[PDB]
Amino acid sequence: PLRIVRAESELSTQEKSYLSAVEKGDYASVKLALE
Amino acid sequence: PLRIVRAESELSTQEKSYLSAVEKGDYASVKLALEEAEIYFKININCIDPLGRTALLIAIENENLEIIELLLSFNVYVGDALLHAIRKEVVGAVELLLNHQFSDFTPDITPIILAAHTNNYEIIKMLVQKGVSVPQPHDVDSLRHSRSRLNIYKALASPSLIALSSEDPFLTAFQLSWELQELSKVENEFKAEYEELSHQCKHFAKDLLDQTRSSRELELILNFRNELARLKLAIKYRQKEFVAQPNCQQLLASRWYDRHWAGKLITCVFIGLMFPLLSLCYLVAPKSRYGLFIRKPFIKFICHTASYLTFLFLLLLASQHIVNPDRQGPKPTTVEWMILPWVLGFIWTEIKQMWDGGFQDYIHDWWNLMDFVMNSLYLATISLKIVAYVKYSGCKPRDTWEMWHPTLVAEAVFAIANIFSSLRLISLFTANSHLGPLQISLGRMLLDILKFLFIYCLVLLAFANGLNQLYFYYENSEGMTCKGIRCERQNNAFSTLFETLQSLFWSIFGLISLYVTNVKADHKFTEFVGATMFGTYNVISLVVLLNMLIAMMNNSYQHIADHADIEWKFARTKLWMSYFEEGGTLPPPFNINVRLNHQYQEVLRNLVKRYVAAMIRDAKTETEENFKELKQDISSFRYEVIGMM
Numbered sequence: 001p002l003r004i005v006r007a008e009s010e011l012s013t014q015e016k017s018y019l020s021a022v023e024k025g026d027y028a029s030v031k032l033a034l035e
Numbered sequence: 036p037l038r039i040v041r042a043e044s045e046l047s048t049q050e051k052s053y054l055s056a057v058e059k060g061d062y063a064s065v066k067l068a069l070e071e072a073e074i075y076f077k078i079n080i081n082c083i084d085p086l087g088r089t090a091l092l093i094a095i096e097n098e099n100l101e102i103i104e105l106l107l108s109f110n111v112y113v114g115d116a117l118l119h120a121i122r123k124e125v126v127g128a129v130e131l132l133l134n135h136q137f138s139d140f141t142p143d144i145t146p147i148i149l150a151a152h153t154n155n156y157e158i159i160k161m162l163v164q165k166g167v168s169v170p171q172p173h174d175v176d177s178l179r180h181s182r183s184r185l186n187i188y189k190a191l192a193s194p195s196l197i198a199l200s201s202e203d204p205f206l207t208a209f210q211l212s213w214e215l216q217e218l219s220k221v222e223n224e225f226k227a228e229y230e231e232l233s234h235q236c237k238h239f240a241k242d243l244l245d246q247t248r249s250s251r252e253l254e255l256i257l258n259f260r261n262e263l264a265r266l267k268l269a270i271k272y273r274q275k276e277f278v279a280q281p282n283c284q285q286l287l288a289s290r291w292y293d294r295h296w297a298g299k300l301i302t303c304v305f306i307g308l309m310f311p312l313l314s315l316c317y318l319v320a321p322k323s324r325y326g327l328f329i330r331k332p333f334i335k336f337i338c339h340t341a342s343y344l345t346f347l348f349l350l351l352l353a354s355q356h357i358v359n360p361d362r363q364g365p366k367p368t369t370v371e372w373m374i375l376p377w378v379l380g381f382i383w384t385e386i387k388q389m390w391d392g393g394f395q396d397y398i399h400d401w402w403n404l405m406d407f408v409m410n411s412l413y414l415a416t417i418s419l420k421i422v423a424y425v426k427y428s429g430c431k432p433r434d435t436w437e438m439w440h441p442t443l444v445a446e447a448v449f450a451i452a453n454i455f456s457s458l459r460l461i462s463l464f465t466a467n468s469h470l471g472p473l474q475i476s477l478g479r480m481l482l483d484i485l486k487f488l489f490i491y492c493l494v495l496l497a498f499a500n501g502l503n504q505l506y507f508y509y510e511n512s513e514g515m516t517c518k519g520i521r522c523e524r525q526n527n528a529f530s531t532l533f534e535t536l537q538s539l540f541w542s543i544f545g546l547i548s549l550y551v552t553n554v555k556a557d558h559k560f561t562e563f564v565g566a567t568m569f570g571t572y573n574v575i576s577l578v579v580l581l582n583m584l585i586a587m588m589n590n591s592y593q594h595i596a597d598h599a600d601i602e603w604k605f606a607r608t609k610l611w612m613s614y615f616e617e618g619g620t621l622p623p624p625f626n627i628n629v630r631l632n633h634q635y636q637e638v639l640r641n642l643v644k645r646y647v648a649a650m651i652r653d654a655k656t657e658t659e660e661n662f663k664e665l666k667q668d669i670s671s672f673r674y675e676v677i678g679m680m
């Protein structure tokens with residue numbers, strides 16, 4: 001069969017770096033994000 | 036034994052240190068080692084370690100992305116590294132590898148199939164966002180034809196894949212679990228894996244239904260597509276786990292019922308006493324005062340039970356001496372005239388149930404063949420009676436009648452018929468919480484008894500053959516007014532095959548005396564042989580055969596009684612749902628979607644979202660939740676030290 005996503009939207013491109021920074025633990029980069 | 040290494044080789048003297056540096060995570064050493072761009076001193080970046088691991092695959096094993104990217108920038112050969120990253124469940128490696136003869140994977144395995152096998156939500160969604168398709172399940176090298184078919188069914192039966200690529204996850208789980216169960220019967224070599232795959236599909240529907248927050252959602256899921264349409268659909272697919280769920284069981288019990296031990300039996304008896312009052316009230320005027328009172332399923336169930344116990348009463352009253360002597364070809368008495376409406380109602384119910392199903396799944400159950408036999412016997416009884424009434428007359432002593440007389444056969448068949456009528460009442464035990472589970476697990480271990488009959492009957496026939504062959508030359512019939520073993524002086528136990536077959540059955544209970552092995556002659560050798568074979572039959576059947584029939588029933592009772600509450604609840608709801616409709620509210624004695632889709636999908640989206648959230652964000656802990664805490668602390672330390680300088 002052919003499968004496609006069902007009712008799921010994409011978030012963003014820039015915010016991926018912010019999420020990775022808040023996940024890993026880089027305190028400098030996250031502070032740059034909220035600046 | 037001067038052993039040697041057979042069928043192998045040696046890697047190198049230089050690349051061993053490079054592989055070690057890759058393993059230790061040294062960024063600078065492996066960066067300078069790879070800097071031999073287009074001018075190499077005979078060092079292969081595609082070297083394979085003695086265990087088969089490669090430098091690119093080594094970094095995947097530690098999910099360290101820096102050397103992964105460094106290797107990828109130099110165009111190292113991948114081949115199947117994406118499959119390894121998918122199998123090891125590394126999101127970063129899959130992200131990096133998604134945009135750029137010996138294999139340890141089966142040739143028909145595709146990345147989507149393996150990703151669905153690992154049941155990782157992130158990787159499956161990532162692959163689906165790019166656009167993939169699994170071959171449909173729909174012979175020359177049959178070993179890999181069955182393996183390929185099994186793999187695609189394992190990927191299809193995964194909660195992660197169903198949750199994001201199915202129009203209705205509540206429906207694709209019913210059908211796929213059904214066909215997985217019936218596919219384990221045509222492929223008997225893999226029946227232990229197909230049936231364990233179907234069992235996990237039944238749990239998925241129950242878990243998805245477990246996420247309801249309010250009774251508004253629950254009544255909308257089961258009423259999709261007159262009333263409780265989807266709930267009856269789950270019963271058809273034999274979804275015992277889905278049906279036997281507490282939240283829906285509560286609603287079903289609320290519909291059923293619409294007090295202490297001495298406060299419930301007394302009022303049940305009180306209601307059952309006036310059975311023929313609010314049954315004639317129904318025919319006279321279906322008003323809310325009395326006509327609608329019997330519409331309650333609990334009241335209707337009591338009416339049908341008390342009306343059946345009444346039938347069993349005057350059935351017991353037809354054998355009394357008070358109510359047509361020993362006359363030949365008699366007319367029916369006053370009891371039989373009252374019996375006739377019950378038989379007619381039962382026959383009418385069986386007739387209206389016969390064509391409602393077309394003998395498919397209608398006679399396949401054990402509780403319908405017995406009913407059919409009962410009505411057949413009753414019909415034979417009435418036919419024999421009416422036949423004998425019109426061709427026989429005159430008062431004659433009963434002792435002088437010849438056997439096979441129509442009246443005698445009629446009463447014998449009637450006596451046989453009402454044994455099944457009283458034994459059918461055992462089917463009502465499933466409505467009581469105490470005798471319910473006991474009765475359900477009673478008829479389930481009975482199927483294991485039927486397999487010992489196949490050896491018991493063989494032993495019986497084997498010994499009967501020898502006993503008859505030995506004793507058939509000594510039979511006599513002079514001086515014997517009575518003949519057989521059903522006599523005060525048993526004389527001819529082993530004379531014929533029909534007598535030998537039933538004189539060995541009565542010896543199980545010890546009702547055959549020891550002098551039946553004697554002959555009217557001074558032949559001690561044959562008598563001893565016959566006694567020895569009789570004793571050997573006694574030992575085998577009573578000390579060995581019947582001793583190990585119970586030796587497995589308790590060892591099979593353990594498996595049956597494990598999930599003994601789901602089966603009982605399924606039986607009880609099957610019984611309940613037969614009293615929820617109109618058409619049967621008449622005891623046998625007195626019988627003779629544009630917006631619906633909108634709401635359903637908007638509820639189902641929330642249900643699926645809650646299920647997936649509770650499945651990913653609440654399963655990392657189920658020890659592993661604190662493993663990433665140390666990694667977070669170490670990463671923060673590393674970032675602080677690196678950025679400070």
Ligand SMILES: Cn1c(=O)n(CCCO)c(=O)c2c1nc(Oc1ccc(/N=N/c3ccccc3)c(OC(F)(F)F)c1)n2Cc1ccc(Cl)cc1
Pocket residue numbers: 563566567568569570571574
């Ligand atoms: C089957 N039967 C039998 O039909 N009648 C009726 C004959 C006419 O009424 C017996 O009277 C009888 C009997 N069985 C025994 O006693 C045993 C029990 C177990 C034996 N062996 N067990 C095993 C178990 C494991 C391995 C090996 C042997 C055994 O040894 C034997 F003879 F080989 F069976 C004899 N008696 C009583 C009897 C005994 C001896 C004698 Cl001289 C006369 C009568």
